[PDB]
């Protein structure tokens, strides 16, 4: 099964700050998870079906960092790289 670390910093709606997020959906279809980011976790959560095919960041010099990974709870840890 696929489960994952969940995070929301703007939790004015029903969604809590953290906790995992059980990831369900399409059949034989691949599921993936994510994370985005003093370090500020903007949001983490499940991510639908290639940027995801460890959670690492590729796109250089952005202002809002983002990683994408496959494999349960992979999103807990995130880090930075170059291109």
């Amino acid at each position: 099964t696929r489960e994952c670390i969940y995070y929301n910093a703007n939790w004015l709606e029903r969604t809590n700050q953290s906790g995992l997020e059980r990831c369900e959906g399409e059949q034989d279809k691949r599921l993936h998870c994510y994370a985005s980011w003093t370090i500020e976790l903007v949001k983490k959560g499940c991510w639908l079906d290639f940027n995801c095919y460890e959670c690492v960041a590729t796109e250089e010099n952005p202002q809002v960092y983002f990683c994408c990974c496959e494999g349960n709870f992979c999103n807990e840890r995130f880090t930075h790289l170059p291109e």
Binding site: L48, N51, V64
Partner: protein, 59 residues
């Protein structure tokens, strides 16, 4: 009829597709939502519905 392409919102950068061929119309039958991270009046996670044409066919 056939499934033939990719084009370049925080993420992803680019999504995918087209349905082409002939019928004795060849249009998509199966579609695909996909995740999107972007800004909303200076961010939200909506796993968005049918942005991609999964499988095609006739009328």
């Amino acid at each position: 009829c056939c499934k033939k392409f990719f084009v370049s919102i925080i993420a992803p950068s680019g999504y995918h597709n087209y349905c082409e061929g002939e019928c004795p119309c060849c249009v998509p039958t199966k579609l695909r939502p996909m995740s999107m991270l972007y800004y909303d009046d200076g961010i939200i996670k909506k796993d968005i519905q049918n942005m991609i044409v999964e499988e095609c066919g006739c009328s």
